Amino acid sequence: QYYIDPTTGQPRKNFLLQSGNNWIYFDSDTGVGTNALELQFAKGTVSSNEQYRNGNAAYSYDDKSIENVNGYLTADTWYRPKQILKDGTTWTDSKETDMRPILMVWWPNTLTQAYYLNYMKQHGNLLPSALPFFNADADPAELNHYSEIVQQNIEKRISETGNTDWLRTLMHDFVTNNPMWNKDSENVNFSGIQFQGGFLKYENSDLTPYANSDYRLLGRMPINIKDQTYRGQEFLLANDIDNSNPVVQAEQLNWLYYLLNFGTITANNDQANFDSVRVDAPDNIDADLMNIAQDYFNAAYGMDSDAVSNKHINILEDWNHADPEYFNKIGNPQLTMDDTIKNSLNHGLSDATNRWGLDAIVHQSLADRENNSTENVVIPNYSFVRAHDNNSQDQIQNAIRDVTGKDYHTFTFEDEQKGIDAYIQDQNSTVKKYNLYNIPASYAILLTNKDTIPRVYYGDLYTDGGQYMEHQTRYYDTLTNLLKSRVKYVAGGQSMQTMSVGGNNNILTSVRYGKGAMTATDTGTDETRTQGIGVVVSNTPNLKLGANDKVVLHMGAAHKNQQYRAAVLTTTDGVINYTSDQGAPVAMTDENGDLYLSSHNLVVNGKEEADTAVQGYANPDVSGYLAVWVPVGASDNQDARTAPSTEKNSGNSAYRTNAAFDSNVIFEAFSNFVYTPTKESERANVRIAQNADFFASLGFTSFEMAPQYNSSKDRTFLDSTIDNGYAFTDRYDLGMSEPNKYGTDEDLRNAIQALHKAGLQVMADWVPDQIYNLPGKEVATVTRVDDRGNVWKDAIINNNLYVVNTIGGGEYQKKYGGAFLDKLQKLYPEIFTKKQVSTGVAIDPSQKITEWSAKYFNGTNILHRGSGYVLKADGGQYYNLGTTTKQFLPIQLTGEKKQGNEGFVKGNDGNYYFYDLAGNMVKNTFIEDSVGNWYFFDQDGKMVENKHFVDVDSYGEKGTYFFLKNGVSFRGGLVQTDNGTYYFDNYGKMVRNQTINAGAMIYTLDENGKLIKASYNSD
Ligand SMILES: [Ca+2]
């Protein structure tokens, strides 16, 4: 029963002996000999490979174990396995911190698993560099083989470095490479208003009850409230706030109260409150918010008196041409802009080529100013030449783009400064490429215009770049003079005329009569004789008046035989200004009251009179001609402005367009490209407080401030790169958590208070459209759309699940969110009862928005996460922990394969086959079982049981093996045949041409495998 070794004396353990026709194998434990021909194949034998199924399965189904968003799984998912291959060798029970990538064990298809291996080989070095790339034809079992080795190598590197930080860098880099999980499947398009690459629209679904909303009305601009006309562009930037939702509508009213009472809310201050608001993107939001803002302003401020209304002058950013109508119909709660004068001035004077006829300035506007002598007749409006977002934002950016070649997507301060340098040099040039022509000429018309409030842009007084008021522009001296002249002289009716002498409808005459006179035939009151103004402007630099042609300033019957001094004159190099009466060239009117100018110079008692002749000029200041004439003998303290009436208005409008309305001037007190201060003294709001009286000196009554909200600094759009204040995370944060680009909340309060003491209004930039960069993640059902909201051409993210950044808001959003709705409902109950048009129902204060979510948003900008970023199964079923939808996880995390496969299977005639964890028939591979037996499967996957010396190639293992009739490869022992005794090492490989030391014995072997000499040796 036992073979006992002659040399050692011990019974032979693990020994095979041939005796004629019989083969006897001796036991490895004791040495009991049984017939090797009758060796049984194990009945319920399982592979050591199935130890992975036990370990790689998830620890549990909790937030702690498996990382999840809203319930679902993502491509960048770490999970907690049951066991860890510590150093890629030993299975160990996982701790709470042991987190592994889901893509290490799971793949959506075999193709991406092949792409996984190729990426982890090249960029990861977790596979041999000599190993070839895996194609689409690669064997699924072979792909499973190498991917399992990658796990071993991953765990090896973790045991060496002690980090998992390199993994999150490597796995995220892999995710972004596939067209499944990046911007490739996003349909990235920059059509029109799609600044950030396009938009995704949130939709109601069973899969995401969080994303559900009964409202979400799109394109509800002022013209399209009732949805009667065409719907506008609802989506603009970042996370588009749903303003159809009455819960949000109440929150917007709550936020409006916060801005209008800021000083009281934060520091119990009285004079540190905003008096008016600027509606940011009115044509992009649900225009219900206009009526809500109207309802509050009529109830809290009670705007039915000219004296009360003109102390709170609200304005709109309505670029729509049909908007002045609607806002006039609803009673002008906020002032509509006059885009028509802007077009008439820009295309008439500012254009580089093919200027408009200057008839446009006269006729094309909300007020025809040819013979305007009537009051309270036109739509109350504000007008401007340039703004922060208009006629600058794109040009300045182009200057940076030309000098350095960079977008707002990374340029640094240095490259921003280089662009500004080129922009200001261009500004101070005769031929301009980025700057508008005839700025002083444009402003000379604007500030002398009747039936409109003018708005002076910051970038026209101070440089668009630099620190706040660090540098003054070229046009500073002229505009400041014109603004001071407006206070003294500009009043009464207006008269305008055009000549066709040089070009076609060039050369314009602009005349104001002064307080007391409306028409030309009006003789005027007492004050009229020194009031009024005369402006001559031409747009052609080629202008050469005829020897007989004369330009006439018809000052009217009020100014018969008066003396007029020069205020602004055009020279060959630039312009000359005169602030006082002394030093200025003088001109006289006739019996009719006409100031004659011609091709020849003016003459007083035999004098040349400086530069007084009307002719075409070409210099950095004027590309045409400019002249401003002013009556002499004016008081030092003269004020042409008329006081607002305290009478109750019988009409149904918030603002009347009288002369007292014309007394106001708005200052847009910022450019988008102001530099972020380094010193405390370089802060914008500190300097506004210091120069508070100076802003009154120019005649500014309404002071439009920059949006004081803290920037997101995400560099997704321009508003977050230079930090305007239009790109914010926290709506209620006004330099409170950290100082913004303009200063702290204390600096802001000081600025507002100083302006109130100087006798000015202060405007809050109300931005109810979007919220930038939110910290929390959420899964919502989306649809790829355009700016208006229409489904994209061939949208591949149509009704797909997507991870969006909607959760968040900030500290002060959580503090003041809906915190004033309780007081507002008690104070003014009429606001909360009024049924909103478009919504159908009134605003809803019952829910306070302290934290934002997908419910309160209409949509989002494209996020480049991928259309298949939310993990779904092979046949299209989204993986979930059971929170939102039915619990479903992959076969890897549960850890139980079931089909006609896995482990060892006997298939009728085909002997024994092996199927791996996935269920693929394995060929040319050695498979070790749970106990420690290696079985080989040939080129057909059939188990070998020959008992003959068979050569195997396998996975780079060139060697000769021996297979018993049970299926096990013989290893670590001797086989005695009729040809001699043969030895096989611990791996089943036959030892040849070597003297080896096995146990207590030493075996010498030749090039045939036969034993030469077996000897015992100790010590
Ligand atoms: Ca919107």
* CATH number assigned to the domain comprising residue 209: 3.20.20.80
Instruction: Mark whether 282 and 359 lie in a shared domain.
Output: no
Q: How many CB atoms lie within 10 A of CB 83?
A: 18
For residues 367 and 373, what is the distance between their CA atoms, to the nearest angstrom? 11
DSSP per residue over 211-231, as a string? S--S-------GGGSSS-S--
Instruction: Mark whether 826 and 770 lie in a shared domain.
Output: yes
For residues 655 and 476, what is the distance between their CA atoms, to the nearest angstrom? 31
For residues 390 and 380, what is the distance between their CA atoms, to the nearest angstrom? 22
Q: Strands of 416-549 (E only): list them.
A: 453-457, 494-498, 508-512, 533-538
Residue with tokens 């007008």: 383
Q: Are 490 and 448 in contact (CB under 8 A)?
A: yes
How would you list the strands of the sheet with 336-337, edge to edge? 315-316, 276-279, 763-766, 702-704, 666-668, 453-457, 381-384, 336-337
Give me the amino acid identity at 207: L
Query: Residue 710 Cα, ligand 1 centroid: separation in angstroms?
Result: 20
Instruction: Mark whether 635 and 776 lie in a shared domain.
Output: no
Query: Residue 788 Cα, ligand 1 centroid: separation in angstroms?
Result: 10
Instruction: Mark whether 953 and 1005 lie in a shared domain.
Output: yes
Instruction: Mark whether 940 and 830 lie in a shared domain.
Output: no
Query: Residue 233 Cα, ligand 1 centroid: separation in angstroms?
Result: 8
Domain extent at residue 649: 338-762
* Residues pairing with 871 in the sheet: none
Residue with tokens 């309404």: 702
For residues 620 and 626, what is the distance between their CA atoms, to the nearest angstrom? 13
Query: Residue 859 Cα, ligand 1 centroid: separation in angstroms?
Result: 9
Query: Residue 236 Cα, ligand 1 centroid: separation in angstroms?
Result: 7
Query: Residue 352 Cα, ligand 1 centroid: separation in angstroms?
Result: 35
Query: Residue 62 Cα, ligand 1 centroid: separation in angstroms?
Result: 37
For 89, the token pair is: 């060798």
Q: What share of the chain is helix, strand, coil (3-state, %, to 5)?
A: 25, 20, 55
Chain centroid to CA 965: 70
- How far CA 433 is from CA of 385, 404, 437, 618, in Å, comes to 17, 16, 9, 15
For 975, the token pair is: 């086989």
> In this structure, what DSSP letter does residue 888 have?
B
* Residues pairing with 335 in the sheet: 315
> In this structure, what DSSP letter does residue 33 have?
E
Query: Residue 241 Cα, ligand 1 centroid: separation in angstroms?
Result: 6
Annotated binding-site residue? 240 = yes
Which of 846, 867, 888 terminates a domain? The answer is 867
For 827, the token pair is: 């104070």
Query: Residue 791 Cα, ligand 1 centroid: separation in angstroms?
Result: 17
Annotated binding-site residue? 799 = no
Query: Residue 287 Cα, ligand 1 centroid: separation in angstroms?
Result: 10
Instruction: Mark whether 639 and 778 lie in a shared domain.
Output: no
Q: Are 262 and 732 in contact (CB under 8 A)?
A: no
For residues 462 and 473, what is the distance between their CA atoms, to the nearest angstrom? 5
Reduced to 3 states (helix: H, G, I; strand: E, B; else coil), residue 319 is coil
Q: Strands of 532-619 (E only): list them.
A: 533-538, 550-554, 563-570, 575-577, 586-588, 594-598
Query: Residue 242 Cα, ligand 1 centroid: separation in angstroms?
Result: 7
**Would you state the torsion angle of the CA atoms of residues 889, 891, 896, 902, taken in this order, to the nearest 10 degrees?**
170
Method: X-ray
Chain centroid to CA 854: 16
CA angle 500, 502, 503 (to 5 degrees): 70
Instruction: Mark whether 826 and 954 lie in a shared domain.
Output: no
Instruction: Mark whether 17 and 159 lie in a shared domain.
Output: no
Q: Are 763 and 705 in contact (CB under 8 A)?
A: yes
**Would you state the torsion angle of the CA atoms of residues 893, 896, 897, 899, taken in this order, to the nearest 10 degrees?**
-140
Reduced to 3 states (helix: H, G, I; strand: E, B; else coil), residue 414 is helix
Q: How many CA atoms lie within 13 A of 579 on its CB side?
A: 10
Query: Residue 193 Cα, ligand 1 centroid: separation in angstroms?
Result: 12
For residues 179 and 942, what is the distance between their CA atoms, to the nearest angstrom? 40
* Residues pairing with 903 in the sheet: 915
> In this structure, what DSSP letter does residue 668 have?
E
For 845, the token pair is: 């204060």
Which of 722, 744, 762 terminates a domain? The answer is 762
Annotated binding-site residue? 284 = yes
Query: Residue 898 Cα, ligand 1 centroid: separation in angstroms?
Result: 51
Q: How many CB atoms lie within 10 A of CB 497?
A: 16
> In this structure, what DSSP letter does residue 682 have?
G
CA angle 309, 312, 314 (to 5 degrees): 105
Q: How many CB atoms lie within 10 A of CB 270?
A: 10
Q: Is 636 exposed, middle or buried (0-12, 13-18, 19+ CB in 10 A)?
A: exposed
Give residues with Cβ within 8 angstroms of 169, minimum separation 6: none
Query: Residue 434 Cα, ligand 1 centroid: separation in angstroms?
Result: 31
Instruction: Mark whether 60 and 155 lie in a shared domain.
Output: yes
Annotated binding-site residue? 787 = no
Query: Residue 694 Cα, ligand 1 centroid: separation in angstroms?
Result: 38
Q: Are 369 and 450 in contact (CB under 8 A)?
A: yes
Quick one: resolution in A? 3.6
Q: How many CB atoms lie within 10 A of CB 561?
A: 10
For 589, the token pair is: 């009117």
Instruction: Mark whether 66 and 171 lie in a shared domain.
Output: yes
CATH of the domain at 20: 2.30.30.20
Helix ranges, 186-267 (H): 246-260, 262-267
**Would you state the torsion angle of the CA atoms of residues 490, 496, 497, 503, taken in this order, to the nearest 10 degrees?**
80
Give residues with Cβ within 8 angstroms of 912, minimum separation 6: 41, 904, 905, 906, 935, 937, 942, 943, 967
For 289, the token pair is: 């918010």
Which of 762, 792, 815 terminates a domain? The answer is 762
Q: What phi and psi, each to the nearest 5 degrees, are found at residue 140?
A: -55, -35
Q: What phi and psi, each to the nearest 5 degrees, are found at residue 120?
A: -75, -15
Nearest by Cα to 850 from 880, 886, 821: 821
Nearest by Cα to 513 from 541, 538, 493: 493
Reduced to 3 states (helix: H, G, I; strand: E, B; else coil), residue 361 is helix
DSSP per residue over 975-1015, as a string? EEETTEEEEE-TTSPBP-SEEEEETTEEEEE-TTSBEEEEE
Q: Are 234 and 789 in contact (CB under 8 A)?
A: yes
Q: How many CB atoms lie within 10 A of CB 325?
A: 14
Instruction: Mark whether 316 and 428 lie in a shared domain.
Output: no
Chain centroid to CA 384: 29
Instruction: Mark whether 191 and 331 lie in a shared domain.
Output: no
- How far CA 686 is from CA of 470, 744, 762, 875, in Å, comes to 13, 9, 15, 63
- How far CA 434 is from CA of 199, 356, 700, in Å, comes to 31, 20, 28
CATH of the domain at 457: 3.20.20.470
> In this structure, what DSSP letter does residue 728 have?
B
Q: Strands of 516-577 (E only): list them.
A: 533-538, 550-554, 563-570, 575-577
Query: Residue 216 Cα, ligand 1 centroid: separation in angstroms?
Result: 10
In the chain, how many domains are there?
4
Nearest by Cα to 645 from 299, 308, 333: 308
